[PDB]
């Protein structure tokens, strides 16, 4: 894939619309990334505008979804990619993750650097992933793990 | 503890003159954790103004770092939180960790609503730890894991 | 409920909308909640883009305010929450509440943690409402009452 | 009183003083407040440079923290108010009194406007109360009471 | 009236066909608001999205400007107010008014609590007017008035 | 005068220094206004650092509030003006008369343009003065004047 | 002229058309401006939504550029001026007139002090105007006037 | 001259303590500048921070305002420039030349790449001068010379 | 070319034109600058906004891609530059590049005013080219070079 | 080296002092990195804040500097990066380089996807040298080279 986007309001106003085909469906992100080999947060991504889809998966969620051709192959583009409307997230789902970071930050940099050395943890060669799991004491939590490479930071 | 603060620049000057001192000492925070039934990040939050150190954890680590009265006492405080100079980080090792909210926030969104319905996973009924492994194509990867409380949302 | 929204302005465009044929019809708040089993607060959110209305109450609402079947279904999904438009409200009875926290903020903060220790008032776990009440000294107030768990920030 | 400020850090540096030594005295706000006749969110706030005290509670509250005569002076100046460092709150206890903007200010502004009419609800011809409570089912909740005057917007 | 915009754009979109139909007529806004028994701020106000008119008023000055029927109901909806663009006008005629603000904002706050005490100006219980005076050395000058009843703000 | 500044800190510095001497000895701005042949809303601007004093007002004033050399020379020079500490105030007193631009600015500017034309109303050919007066339904009422030359904009 | 815009993008939307019309023509500035009586400066601001024409030279330019009756129109209102999209541009072109400001702004004010007094030269009793001239070295030259009345601020 | 600044305020605080040394000597900065050979603006803006001086002017200027040897050596150094507190003046007599952009900045770089081309008037290769005329109609001007490079952008 | 943009919208709305007919063709930036004698980086530029395309070249591309005659005399008009989005990029290949900014920015500077001294690199002459190579370690690497005229600052 | 710091100001603030000591000994950031075996781009970026020198080098950089022990500790302690004051530099010098992005960014990220794919150039395996060439047409020019490893984004 050679071909990229540089105004993400195309892809998000693909989101919108896939997101209300999906409603209309029924359907999960789950079952919309079964069959395409690929992990649901990836695929989840790709129909929100932050990843591009493989011709073969882009093909099949868009048969799952009634997509037309020009919004299967905008699936494929590698996207400009920002989630967020406008820096810090609105929306409270969203800004836990926010304060996550406001709270424990420094730690992160701190603990990365002592386990690791300078550099930093890799957004790029990266995947997450969210699991449910039982609370001792009563409800759910949701484990959601964040796997990054090491890059050195290192004189020249 | 019902004592707490609202200016936060006076634990983060204290939190600079205890990395000097910890620098000095040639102590890491694993070392300067040990001893205390604490998790190092939690522990190293306190140390960086963004937790409240028990007051046998804080006169531990205060010991090590020979820090003053009025230091020990601050640290037991209830903090100002937020450990980011001006919303978005500057540095290249905190902002990739807010750059994995840019491209994978909605993500994260959609699938915790997915698998447990409206509502948040918690910054507060919540733990995070860094794990360093081997990456099997080599070289080294962190794996952090955040886990967090499911609060639902629903109709009154 | 497992669908979600990532982009506040699909369902802002329905709540004008929603709010225009309020208009023509002459309805309040309080009688488009009527039947539904659920609070002015709740419903008037879901209207305004904040909250999710269960089938039952989408339906009813979106007959009374002869809403399409997309519409109907726009207000089931989880919204993509915000509702001020750029982060500080410019409308004086909106600014009047942030004015409360810049005045209060730091009391609010500093008496949830002397009564009931480190952590929240959950915004999530959590209700509102609004009452009218007669002021002895003349005209009229209103009591707005804010009601949310605490949650403990517990170290680990 | 005819004297006021203009610029916030004053007062603001005179309330971290004042919480400096109302921790080594392990006091609390409600102690703080006991005898002088006023509301313990109003002192509360005054303390930390929100409010004037009236001269015999700036004197009484002087000597239970061992305040100097310029402190005790400056308490009872008419402040330059706002205690948010910079516009939105960082730490997660003041935040969420934001969030609840978020959600709900739109409501909050509709409903004022159905039960009320055109106008506000007053941020002066105001009080503010934090009330804990038994959550019934299982810990402790805020109940937190916004009371303020409607003042009605007319035409001339 | 109980209706209420949640978004400007409806009202300003409104007041930019009302100017265009303003300007083909040849229409002043003394001429418009001739005739309501109000004053010329206040319908010019309503017309440019920042009040409502009432209904006797809405139809006087909707049959003056040839509008269609919604947008007569349209300025008989409480607005979202807030006039300005993005917070600070770039408009040189408009920007004088905030420089004055910025020039004499804590003269202001000086004087008014000199006189009246802590508290404010209200900018609800106000009127506005605008008048053209001849300037003794030549010209001419605005003389604006803003009245606002004092609010006090009291221990409580 | 041909001095000036440009840091405005330095008189802002000052001005915190005159209110305290202002408040220890009990003074008012009117009074202190007296004997100076000036009006007090110049005389409280310059103090706060707004405006600069002729020779003869700042020797007066500084005898006044027992002001140093250096101090009734800064009062002197020409100031870096801007008094808002972050472009919008967040003190209520203040915020009024910036909410009252957000209300009526672009009614300011139509009904400027309307009797005056194309052009401004100065903020610099131009004078204030604020007045207390009786409500006549109860209470008391600011009547506050802003009196600027027209400038107009004119082709060339 | 009486008629004024508050919304700029109406006459921003109009000099995209302008700008268009003046392409497909093989149009100048300068040619747009012959025969108006006016300086280019002026009319290309106006054509640019900064400046209001005269009727004689609106129709003018109107045959010129092939315009509609409403643009013509349009090009007579007052606007709501401000040409650049967020406060700093982005532009080169635009942004170097923009770092004269921040190299010089405090000269050119310490240098209008000294040469004429407290107070402001002015941006509206103002002409501008661009020549070009030969770079002695090689190349080329622009000479940008700006002509502005002083307007003295003294004493009341 | 190899030796340069990062942070502004290093020279911006220098300039503070010139402009109070200048003041209690009664100086201008035309007299501070005679004997350079060096324009009266670039003296000015180098003692303002915003450019460097070569070291006989240094010593000079310096002998004049009697600062000390670190002081005349800052002087000679590349500063960080930028002298505007937070991008948009709030001193009303900076304002007008930032408003002078927001009026005229399209017109700017219309009437440049007609006049010249494609590309940009240096900032660089660049001077400016203030001059004083009389005005025909009575009173004062300052007439503005920026006098600029065109540099032209070209293909490759 | 005399004819300039003053609205970023037009040109950036024409390159996603561009770039889904890019799509669809399957063409590479190469191969559409391939033929127009012109460097890739200056036309890939050109058709995303940011640079004007001589006619002969707009011509040619236009063939290639399928564009309309009003498209291909919008890629010979000099645009209004600024690609990003809102001043900061989201998209994290693009972040990298103002990392190095605010990384290695002051470096820059220090190491121009030592090799060359006060003044700037261009960015006006100037050119950047994108190579792709072997990492001698194993991998891909890209050396993007930026080629600038050193633009003195010298008295006047 | 495990230590790192979390507020930029202390090493920012040491810069400084490194800056006045180098202008006062007439050192060159060349002459300050020979014999440490380390790039003039990176000894200069550590002596700003934003590398980490090791031992060897920060004791040989400290002694030419004639710092004391505190500081060159500090130098080898990992930094919390970020040179620009404000997000967007004011220094002509350093603003090019932002410009450069604002005009070629979205080149950058299209030319990267399209010679490597999807992912970023690195800007932690990276290097950064500055060489001046002379210029054929007359006078000099700076060859900066950015030199990244490629790291893919894939599926998973």
Same mark, same amino acid.
């Given at each position: ?35 395409? !080999? ?10 929100? *505008?932050?990843?591009?889809? =493989? /011709? ?6 868009? /048969? ?17 990619? *920002? ?5 810090? =997230? ?14 424990? *930050? ?10 690791? !050395?300078? *550099? ?15 609370? =001792?004491? !009563? ?15 290192? =004189?020249?």
């Amino acid at each position: 894939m050679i071909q990229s986007q540089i105004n993400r309001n195309i892809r998000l106003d693909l989101a919108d619309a896939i997101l209300l085909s999906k409603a209309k469906k029924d359907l999960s992100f789950a079952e919309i990334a079964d069959g395409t !080999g690929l992990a649901e947060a990836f695929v989840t991504a790709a129909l929100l *505008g932050q990843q591009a889809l =493989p /011709a073969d998966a882009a093909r099949l969620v868009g /048969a799952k979804l009634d997509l037309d051709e020009d919004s299967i192959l905008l699936l494929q583009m590698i996207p400009l990619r *920002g989630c967020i409307d406008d820096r810090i =997230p609105t929306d409270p789902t969203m800004y836990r993750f926010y304060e996550m970071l406001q709270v424990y *930050g420094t730690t992160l940099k701190a603990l990365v650097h002592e386990k690791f !050395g300078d *550099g930093i943890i890799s957004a790029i060669n990266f995947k997450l992933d969210v699991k449910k799991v039982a609370d =001792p004491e !009563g409800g759910e939590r949701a484990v959601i793990t964040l796997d990054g490479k090491y890059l050195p930071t290192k =004189p020249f």
